[PDB]
Design an enzyme around this catalytic site. Sequence first.
Site, PDB file in Angstrom:
ATOM      1  N   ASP A 193      13.165  14.921  31.095  1.00  0.00           N
ATOM      2  CA  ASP A 193      13.119  16.222  30.504  1.00  0.00           C
ATOM      3  C   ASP A 193      12.450  15.944  29.182  1.00  0.00           C
ATOM      4  OD1 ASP A 193      15.191  15.985  28.648  1.00  0.00           O
ATOM      5  OD2 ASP A 193      16.317  17.265  29.795  1.00  0.00           O
ATOM      6  N   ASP A 195      12.723  17.351  25.051  1.00  0.00           N
ATOM      7  CA  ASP A 195      13.614  18.024  23.989  1.00  0.00           C
ATOM      8  C   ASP A 195      12.727  18.221  22.892  1.00  0.00           C
ATOM      9  OD1 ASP A 195      16.154  17.968  25.839  1.00  0.00           O
ATOM     10  OD2 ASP A 195      15.631  15.744  25.640  1.00  0.00           O
ATOM     11  N   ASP A 250      13.262  21.505  27.080  1.00  0.00           N
ATOM     12  CA  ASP A 250      14.496  22.308  26.092  1.00  0.00           C
ATOM     13  C   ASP A 250      14.027  22.519  24.869  1.00  0.00           C
ATOM     14  OD1 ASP A 250      17.110  20.295  27.621  1.00  0.00           O
ATOM     15  OD2 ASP A 250      16.306  21.968  28.249  1.00  0.00           O
TER      16      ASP A 250
HETATM   17 MG   LIG Z   1      16.449  14.722  27.333  1.00  0.00          MG
HETATM   18 MG   LIG Z   2      20.664  15.579  30.688  1.00  0.00          MG
HETATM   19 NA    NA Z   3      16.891  18.127  27.769  1.00  0.00          NA
END
Ligand SMILES: [Mg+2]
Ligand SMILES: [Mg+2]
Ligand code: NA
Length: 326
Positions: A193, A195, A250
Amino acid sequence: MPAYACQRPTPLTHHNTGLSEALEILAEAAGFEGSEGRLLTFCRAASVLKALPSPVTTLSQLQGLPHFGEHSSRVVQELLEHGVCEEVERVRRSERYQTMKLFTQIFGVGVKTADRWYREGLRTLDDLREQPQKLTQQQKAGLQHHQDLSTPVLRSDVDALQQVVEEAVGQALPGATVTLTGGFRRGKLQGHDVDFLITHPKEGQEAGLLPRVMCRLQDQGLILYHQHFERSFCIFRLPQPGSWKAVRVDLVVAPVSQFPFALLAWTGSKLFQRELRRFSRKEKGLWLNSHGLFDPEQKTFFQAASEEDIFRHLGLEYLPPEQRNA
DNA sequence: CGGCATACG
DNA sequence: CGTAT
DNA sequence: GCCG
Ligand SMILES: [Mg+2]
Ligand SMILES: [Mg+2]
Ligand code: NA
Ligand SMILES: [Cl-]
Ligand code: NA
Protein backbone atom coordinates in the site's frame (compact mmCIF):
# COMPACT_ATOMS: atom_id res chain seq x y z
CA MET A 1 22.56 -4.41 22.16
CA PRO A 2 19.85 -2.17 23.69
CA ALA A 3 16.61 -3.81 24.70
CA TYR A 4 14.21 -1.44 22.88
CA ALA A 5 14.09 -1.31 19.09
CA CYS A 6 13.91 2.49 19.14
CA GLN A 7 17.40 2.60 20.74
CA ARG A 8 19.24 1.01 17.85
CA PRO A 9 19.42 1.53 14.09
CA THR A 10 17.62 -1.12 12.07
CA PRO A 11 18.25 -1.00 8.30
CA LEU A 12 15.92 -2.30 5.65
CA THR A 13 18.37 -4.96 4.47
CA HIS A 14 20.67 -6.77 6.85
CA HIS A 15 22.82 -9.85 7.54
CA ASN A 16 20.43 -12.31 9.17
CA THR A 17 17.54 -12.42 6.72
CA GLY A 18 16.77 -16.15 6.94
CA LEU A 19 16.87 -16.25 10.74
CA SER A 20 14.62 -13.22 11.11
CA GLU A 21 12.13 -14.57 8.54
CA ALA A 22 11.78 -17.80 10.53
CA LEU A 23 11.09 -15.97 13.78
CA GLU A 24 8.56 -13.76 12.00
CA ILE A 25 6.65 -16.88 10.86
CA LEU A 26 6.30 -17.89 14.49
CA ALA A 27 5.20 -14.35 15.37
CA GLU A 28 2.53 -14.39 12.69
CA ALA A 29 1.28 -17.81 13.80
CA ALA A 30 1.11 -16.61 17.40
CA GLY A 31 -1.10 -13.74 16.22
CA PHE A 32 -3.42 -16.11 14.42
CA GLU A 33 -3.96 -17.88 17.75
CA GLY A 34 -4.51 -14.63 19.66
CA SER A 35 -1.22 -14.87 21.60
CA GLU A 36 -0.19 -11.21 21.48
CA GLY A 37 2.60 -11.62 24.05
CA ARG A 38 4.36 -14.37 22.15
CA LEU A 39 3.87 -12.47 18.87
CA LEU A 40 5.66 -9.49 20.43
CA THR A 41 8.57 -11.55 21.73
CA PHE A 42 9.17 -13.27 18.39
CA CYS A 43 8.91 -9.93 16.56
CA ARG A 44 11.40 -8.36 18.98
CA ALA A 45 13.83 -11.27 18.64
CA ALA A 46 13.62 -11.05 14.86
CA SER A 47 14.28 -7.31 15.05
CA VAL A 48 17.40 -7.82 17.19
CA LEU A 49 18.88 -9.95 14.42
CA LYS A 50 18.10 -7.26 11.85
CA ALA A 51 20.15 -4.82 13.95
CA LEU A 52 23.28 -6.96 14.13
CA PRO A 53 26.34 -5.89 12.12
CA SER A 54 27.15 -9.33 10.68
CA PRO A 55 25.66 -12.83 10.32
CA VAL A 56 25.04 -15.05 13.33
CA THR A 57 27.06 -18.20 12.65
CA THR A 58 27.23 -19.83 16.11
CA LEU A 59 24.79 -20.23 18.98
CA SER A 60 27.18 -18.50 21.40
CA GLN A 61 26.67 -15.22 19.53
CA LEU A 62 23.12 -15.07 20.97
CA GLN A 63 24.39 -14.99 24.56
CA GLY A 64 23.31 -11.77 26.18
CA LEU A 65 21.18 -10.56 23.27
CA PRO A 66 17.82 -9.27 24.52
CA HIS A 67 14.66 -11.27 23.72
CA PHE A 68 16.53 -14.53 23.06
CA GLY A 69 15.49 -17.19 25.54
CA GLU A 70 15.09 -20.94 25.30
CA HIS A 71 12.54 -20.94 22.47
CA SER A 72 13.97 -18.33 20.08
CA SER A 73 17.49 -19.68 20.72
CA ARG A 74 16.39 -23.21 19.81
CA VAL A 75 14.88 -21.97 16.52
CA VAL A 76 18.18 -20.29 15.62
CA GLN A 77 20.19 -23.33 16.73
CA GLU A 78 18.22 -25.64 14.43
CA LEU A 79 18.55 -23.30 11.46
CA LEU A 80 22.31 -23.00 12.02
CA GLU A 81 22.74 -26.77 12.41
CA HIS A 82 20.33 -28.13 9.75
CA GLY A 83 19.21 -25.17 7.62
CA VAL A 84 15.63 -25.76 8.71
CA CYS A 85 13.61 -25.52 11.94
CA GLU A 86 11.02 -28.28 12.29
CA GLU A 87 8.58 -26.11 14.24
CA VAL A 88 8.75 -23.37 11.61
CA GLU A 89 8.22 -25.86 8.77
CA ARG A 90 5.31 -27.47 10.60
CA VAL A 91 3.63 -24.07 10.90
CA ARG A 92 4.29 -23.21 7.26
CA ARG A 93 2.60 -26.30 5.88
CA SER A 94 -0.32 -26.36 8.33
CA GLU A 95 -3.81 -25.85 6.95
CA ARG A 96 -4.57 -23.49 9.82
CA TYR A 97 -1.64 -21.15 9.13
CA GLN A 98 -2.14 -21.16 5.36
CA THR A 99 -5.87 -20.42 5.58
CA MET A 100 -5.59 -17.78 8.30
CA LYS A 101 -2.90 -16.05 6.24
CA LEU A 102 -5.07 -16.16 3.11
CA PHE A 103 -8.15 -14.84 4.89
CA THR A 104 -6.45 -12.13 6.98
CA GLN A 105 -4.74 -10.79 3.82
CA ILE A 106 -8.21 -9.80 2.60
CA PHE A 107 -9.00 -6.12 3.12
CA GLY A 108 -11.85 -6.06 5.66
CA VAL A 109 -10.99 -9.41 7.27
CA GLY A 110 -9.10 -9.60 10.54
CA VAL A 111 -7.98 -12.47 12.72
CA LYS A 112 -11.35 -12.81 14.48
CA THR A 113 -13.33 -13.00 11.23
CA ALA A 114 -10.79 -15.34 9.65
CA ASP A 115 -10.85 -17.65 12.67
CA ARG A 116 -14.65 -17.82 12.70
CA TRP A 117 -14.70 -18.67 8.97
CA TYR A 118 -12.00 -21.30 9.53
CA ARG A 119 -14.05 -22.90 12.31
CA GLU A 120 -17.07 -22.90 9.97
CA GLY A 121 -15.04 -24.99 7.52
CA LEU A 122 -14.22 -22.28 4.99
CA ARG A 123 -10.81 -22.60 3.33
CA THR A 124 -10.62 -20.77 -0.04
CA LEU A 125 -11.49 -17.41 -1.55
CA ASP A 126 -14.13 -19.07 -3.71
CA ASP A 127 -15.71 -20.47 -0.54
CA LEU A 128 -16.21 -16.87 0.52
CA ARG A 129 -17.53 -15.72 -2.86
CA GLU A 130 -20.23 -18.42 -2.77
CA GLN A 131 -22.00 -16.80 0.23
CA PRO A 132 -21.68 -13.05 -0.39
CA GLN A 133 -24.62 -12.21 1.88
CA LYS A 134 -22.22 -12.97 4.74
CA LEU A 135 -19.71 -10.31 3.61
CA THR A 136 -19.52 -6.65 4.49
CA GLN A 137 -19.21 -4.16 1.66
CA GLN A 138 -15.58 -3.64 2.64
CA GLN A 139 -14.98 -7.39 2.48
CA LYS A 140 -16.69 -7.56 -0.90
CA ALA A 141 -14.29 -4.90 -2.21
CA GLY A 142 -11.34 -6.67 -0.65
CA LEU A 143 -12.34 -9.95 -2.31
CA GLN A 144 -13.09 -8.38 -5.71
CA HIS A 145 -9.74 -6.62 -5.78
CA HIS A 146 -7.72 -9.30 -3.97
CA GLN A 147 -5.59 -10.31 -6.95
CA ASP A 148 -4.48 -6.76 -7.75
CA LEU A 149 -3.93 -5.98 -4.07
CA SER A 150 -1.62 -9.04 -3.88
CA THR A 151 0.66 -7.58 -6.60
CA PRO A 152 3.54 -5.47 -5.23
CA VAL A 153 3.30 -1.70 -5.55
CA LEU A 154 6.49 -0.27 -7.06
CA ARG A 155 8.22 3.08 -6.61
CA SER A 156 7.05 4.25 -10.06
CA ASP A 157 3.49 3.57 -8.94
CA VAL A 158 4.07 5.71 -5.84
CA ASP A 159 5.30 8.70 -7.85
CA ALA A 160 2.22 8.53 -10.08
CA LEU A 161 -0.18 8.31 -7.15
CA GLN A 162 1.46 11.18 -5.32
CA GLN A 163 0.92 13.48 -8.29
CA VAL A 164 -2.80 12.72 -8.51
CA VAL A 165 -3.25 13.14 -4.73
CA GLU A 166 -1.41 16.49 -4.84
CA GLU A 167 -3.66 17.67 -7.68
CA ALA A 168 -6.82 16.87 -5.71
CA VAL A 169 -5.39 18.26 -2.47
CA GLY A 170 -4.46 21.49 -4.25
CA GLN A 171 -8.03 22.17 -5.38
CA ALA A 172 -9.47 21.08 -2.07
CA LEU A 173 -7.22 23.44 -0.11
CA PRO A 174 -4.58 25.61 -1.77
CA GLY A 175 -1.30 25.48 0.11
CA ALA A 176 -1.94 22.03 1.59
CA THR A 177 0.97 19.61 1.36
CA VAL A 178 1.29 15.87 0.77
CA THR A 179 4.09 13.82 2.38
CA LEU A 180 4.88 10.19 1.52
CA THR A 181 5.01 8.10 4.71
CA GLY A 182 4.94 4.40 5.68
CA GLY A 183 7.37 1.84 4.28
CA PHE A 184 8.21 3.84 1.18
CA ARG A 185 9.54 6.68 3.34
CA ARG A 186 11.73 4.07 5.14
CA GLY A 187 13.26 3.23 1.75
CA LYS A 188 11.25 0.20 0.60
CA LEU A 189 11.36 -0.45 -3.12
CA GLN A 190 8.07 -2.38 -3.11
CA GLY A 191 5.05 -2.43 -0.88
CA HIS A 192 1.44 -3.47 -0.63
CA ASP A 193 0.00 0.00 0.00
CA VAL A 194 0.96 3.66 -0.21
CA ASP A 195 0.68 6.00 2.78
CA PHE A 196 0.26 9.79 2.59
CA LEU A 197 0.10 12.48 5.26
CA ILE A 198 -1.60 15.81 4.44
CA THR A 199 -1.37 19.09 6.36
CA HIS A 200 -1.49 22.87 5.83
CA PRO A 201 0.95 25.46 7.26
CA LYS A 202 -1.89 27.51 8.81
CA GLU A 203 -3.22 25.78 11.93
CA GLY A 204 -6.90 24.98 11.57
CA GLN A 205 -7.12 25.27 7.79
CA GLU A 206 -6.92 21.48 7.52
CA ALA A 207 -10.29 21.04 9.24
CA GLY A 208 -12.80 19.38 6.91
CA LEU A 209 -10.14 18.64 4.34
CA LEU A 210 -10.40 14.94 3.76
CA PRO A 211 -14.05 14.89 2.52
CA ARG A 212 -13.16 17.59 0.01
CA VAL A 213 -10.17 15.55 -1.18
CA MET A 214 -12.12 12.31 -1.47
CA CYS A 215 -14.96 13.95 -3.43
CA ARG A 216 -12.49 15.36 -5.94
CA LEU A 217 -10.69 12.03 -6.35
CA GLN A 218 -14.03 10.23 -6.74
CA ASP A 219 -15.18 12.71 -9.40
CA GLN A 220 -11.95 12.04 -11.35
CA GLY A 221 -12.87 8.33 -11.47
CA LEU A 222 -9.84 7.29 -9.39
CA ILE A 223 -11.56 5.72 -6.37
CA LEU A 224 -12.65 2.13 -6.67
CA TYR A 225 -13.52 1.94 -2.94
CA HIS A 226 -13.63 4.06 0.18
CA GLN A 227 -15.61 4.15 3.41
CA HIS A 228 -17.88 7.05 2.37
CA PHE A 229 -12.99 12.11 9.23
CA GLU A 230 -9.14 12.21 9.30
CA ARG A 231 -8.05 8.78 7.97
CA SER A 232 -9.26 7.27 4.68
CA PHE A 233 -8.47 3.68 3.63
CA CYS A 234 -8.98 3.70 -0.15
CA ILE A 235 -8.59 1.48 -3.17
CA PHE A 236 -7.34 3.61 -6.10
CA ARG A 237 -7.47 2.98 -9.82
CA LEU A 238 -3.89 3.31 -11.00
CA PRO A 239 -3.21 3.62 -14.75
CA GLN A 240 -1.08 0.86 -16.29
CA PRO A 241 0.07 0.51 -19.90
CA GLY A 242 -3.14 -0.26 -21.79
CA SER A 243 -5.06 -0.94 -18.60
CA TRP A 244 -5.00 -0.24 -14.85
CA LYS A 245 -4.68 -1.92 -11.48
CA ALA A 246 -6.20 -1.47 -8.04
CA VAL A 247 -3.87 -0.13 -5.32
CA ARG A 248 -4.44 0.40 -1.58
CA VAL A 249 -3.80 4.01 -0.55
CA ASP A 250 -4.13 5.54 2.91
CA LEU A 251 -4.72 9.27 3.31
CA VAL A 252 -4.27 10.91 6.70
CA VAL A 253 -4.77 14.55 7.72
CA ALA A 254 -3.10 16.23 10.71
CA PRO A 255 -2.92 19.83 11.90
CA VAL A 256 0.52 21.30 11.48
CA SER A 257 1.05 21.50 15.25
CA GLN A 258 0.77 17.69 15.35
CA PHE A 259 2.51 16.99 12.03
CA PRO A 260 5.85 15.79 13.58
CA PHE A 261 4.00 13.28 15.74
CA ALA A 262 1.84 12.07 12.88
CA LEU A 263 4.84 11.83 10.54
CA LEU A 264 6.74 9.83 13.15
CA ALA A 265 3.81 7.50 13.79
CA TRP A 266 2.86 6.90 10.16
CA THR A 267 6.47 6.35 9.08
CA GLY A 268 6.76 3.29 11.35
CA SER A 269 7.74 0.58 11.32
CA LYS A 270 4.83 -0.82 13.32
CA LEU A 271 7.21 -2.50 15.78
CA PHE A 272 9.36 0.64 15.99
CA GLN A 273 6.33 2.70 17.03
CA ARG A 274 5.12 0.14 19.62
CA GLU A 275 8.64 0.04 21.08
CA LEU A 276 8.93 3.85 21.04
CA ARG A 277 5.61 4.27 22.83
CA ARG A 278 6.61 1.55 25.33
CA PHE A 279 9.96 3.27 25.92
CA SER A 280 8.33 6.69 26.37
CA ARG A 281 5.84 5.45 28.97
CA LYS A 282 7.94 2.92 30.88
CA GLU A 283 11.37 4.61 30.85
CA LYS A 284 10.48 8.31 30.60
CA GLY A 285 6.96 8.44 32.07
CA LEU A 286 5.61 10.27 29.02
CA TRP A 287 2.59 9.20 26.92
CA LEU A 288 3.20 9.10 23.13
CA ASN A 289 0.71 8.82 20.28
CA SER A 290 0.28 10.10 16.73
CA HIS A 291 -1.07 13.43 18.04
CA GLY A 292 1.46 14.42 20.71
CA LEU A 293 3.59 13.61 23.73
CA PHE A 294 1.98 14.16 27.13
CA ASP A 295 3.62 14.69 30.53
CA PRO A 296 1.02 13.25 32.94
CA GLU A 297 2.62 14.88 35.99
CA GLN A 298 2.66 18.48 34.70
CA LYS A 299 -0.38 17.76 32.51
CA THR A 300 1.31 19.39 29.51
CA PHE A 301 1.93 18.50 25.86
CA PHE A 302 5.39 18.83 24.32
CA GLN A 303 5.52 21.14 21.33
CA ALA A 304 7.58 19.61 18.57
CA ALA A 305 8.65 21.27 15.34
CA SER A 306 10.39 18.18 13.90
CA GLU A 307 10.95 14.48 14.40
CA GLU A 308 14.40 15.45 15.72
CA ASP A 309 12.61 17.37 18.52
CA ILE A 310 10.70 14.25 19.55
CA PHE A 311 13.78 12.02 19.73
CA ARG A 312 15.52 14.72 21.80
CA HIS A 313 12.60 15.03 24.24
CA LEU A 314 12.74 11.25 24.79
CA GLY A 315 16.52 11.20 25.26
CA LEU A 316 17.10 9.02 22.20
CA GLU A 317 19.68 9.40 19.49
CA TYR A 318 17.97 10.44 16.26
CA LEU A 319 17.28 7.70 13.72
CA PRO A 320 16.39 8.63 10.13
CA PRO A 321 13.43 6.73 8.60
CA GLU A 322 15.74 4.27 6.81
CA GLN A 323 16.98 3.07 10.24
CA ARG A 324 13.49 2.56 11.73
CA ASN A 325 12.92 -0.79 9.98
CA ALA A 326 12.44 -2.76 13.19
C1' DC B 1 3.91 -12.22 38.78
C1' DG B 2 2.19 -8.09 35.36
C1' DG B 3 3.00 -6.19 31.19
C1' DC B 4 3.14 -6.18 26.43
C1' DA B 5 1.13 0.92 21.92
C1' DT B 6 -2.22 3.56 20.64
C1' DA B 7 -5.10 5.36 17.98
C1' DC B 8 -9.44 6.17 14.19
C1' DG B 9 -13.67 4.27 10.77
C1' DC C 1 -15.75 -5.63 14.29
C1' DG C 2 -12.49 -3.39 10.75
C1' DT C 3 -8.29 -0.22 9.56
C1' DA C 4 -3.28 2.04 10.27
C1' DT C 5 1.99 2.77 11.66
C1' DG D 1 7.95 -15.62 25.09
C1' DC D 2 10.57 -12.96 27.42
C1' DC D 3 11.90 -8.94 30.84
C1' DG D 4 12.10 -6.38 34.98
MG1 LIG E 1 2.13 1.08 4.30
MG1 LIG F 1 -0.27 -2.85 7.16
NA1 NA G 1 -1.14 1.98 4.77
CL1 LIG H 1 -1.93 6.99 17.72
NA1 NA I 1 -7.28 -8.03 6.48
